[PDB]
Amino acid sequence: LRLPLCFLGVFVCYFYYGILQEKITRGKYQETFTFALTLVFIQCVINAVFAKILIQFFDTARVDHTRSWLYAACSISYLGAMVSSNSALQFVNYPTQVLGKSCKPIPVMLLGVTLLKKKYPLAKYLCVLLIVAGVALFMYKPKKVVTVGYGELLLLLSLTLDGLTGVSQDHMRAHYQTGSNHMMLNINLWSTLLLGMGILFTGELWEFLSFAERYPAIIYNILLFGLTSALGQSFIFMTVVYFGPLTCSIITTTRKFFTILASVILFANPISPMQWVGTVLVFLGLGLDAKFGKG
Numbered sequence: 001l002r003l004p005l006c007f008l009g010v011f012v013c014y015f016y017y018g019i020l021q022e023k024i025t026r027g028k029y030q031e032t033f034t035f036a037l038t039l040v041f042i043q044c045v046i047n048a049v050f051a052k053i054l055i056q057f058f059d060t061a062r063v064d065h066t067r068s069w070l071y072a073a074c075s076i077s078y079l080g081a082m083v084s085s086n087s088a089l090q091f092v093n094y095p096t097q098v099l100g101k102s103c104k105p106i107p108v109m110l111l112g113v114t115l116l117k118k119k120y121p122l123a124k125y126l127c128v129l130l131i132v133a134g135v136a137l138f139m140y141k142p143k144k145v146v147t148v149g150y151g152e153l154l155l156l157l158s159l160t161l162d163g164l165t166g167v168s169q170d171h172m173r174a175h176y177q178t179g180s181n182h183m184m185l186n187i188n189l190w191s192t193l194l195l196g197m198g199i200l201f202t203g204e205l206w207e208f209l210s211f212a213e214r215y216p217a218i219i220y221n222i223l224l225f226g227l228t229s230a231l232g233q234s235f236i237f238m239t240v241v242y243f244g245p246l247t248c249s250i251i252t253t254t255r256k257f258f259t260i261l262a263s264v265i266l267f268a269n270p271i272s273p274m275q276w277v278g279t280v281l282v283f284l285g286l287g288l289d290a291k292f293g294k295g
């Protein structure tokens with residue numbers, strides 16, 4: 001049973017996803033792409049329909065034991081995190097976003113330690129040193145010699161909301177014995193409903209066609225971005241059931257490092273050497289916990 005599709009499928013698709021996301025966000029159209037909610041709405045609905053058409057061809061005996069409200073709260077947290085992350089690209093540069101967003105464990109770790117009252121032996125005190133050193137050497141100058149950018153605040157709030165969603169997921173999985181496809185399916189429906197409800201009130205989507213009228217070449221790319229996102233979500237779901245979940249961490253780390261490399265190469269984003277070694281340090285620490293002492 002050769003399974004090369006476990007690597008290629010989740011690698012090439014997410015690589016195209018990242019390249020498209022960078023293309024349509026920082027594209028020098030002049031009217032910058034200030035709209036951050038429409039694309040996440042489209043992505044959510046596309047991935048939801050793909051989830052339905054996928055579960056239709058999978059096991060049916062499973063019965064969703066999860067209650068309604070937990071999915072709703074997890075959906076608000078998840079959609080808020082995604083919206084805040086995407087809206088921040090107007091200030092910061094792409095490589096900084098994909099690096100900062102990648103340090104997911106630290107928010108979850110601190111939230112669990114302060115709230116869940118957990119314990120981790122010399123693992124959340126050792127790899128954290130490498131992670132924080134890398135982050136605080138890459139984006140930061142030596143001594144602020146050569147108010148912080150508002151995008152950093154948005155990224156920090158995104159990390160906080162993402163940690164909240166993660167802890168919520170952990171609870172609904174442990175104490176309620178939820179599944180994998182059902183969870184993502186329900187949270188997607190709730191998130192898209194809430195996003196649409198808010199959007200119609202915001203008075204922007206009614207005004208969003210005119211922007212499309214200005215540049216008719218912003219429809220195919222966004223559709224492809226949604227399609228690849230949904231395909232990648234389905235592929236990662238299919239992987240996680242095989243070889244356990246530990247492979248997912250290494251897969252994502254490799255994908256994000258190659259995404260950094262492609263971003264710096266293709267789009268000519270300047271980077272300094274002393275800065276450049278910053279990303280490798282944080283990436284090495286990231287996933288090292290998964291390889292040794294998962295936590």
Ligand SMILES: Nc1ncnc2c1ncn2[C@@H]1O[C@H](COP(=O)(O)OP(=O)(O)NP(=O)(O)O)[C@@H](O)[C@H]1O
Nearest residue numbers: 102104180184233236240245248249250251252253
């Ligand atoms: N059991 C799972 N394992 C991995 N990813 C999952 C799982 N369940 C849901 N996902 C989603 O799969 C995506 C993984 O991509 P990513 O945004 O990089 O998260 P990640 O934690 O950094 N990578 P990963 O360790 O595989 O979850 C996210 O959108 C997760 O919400």
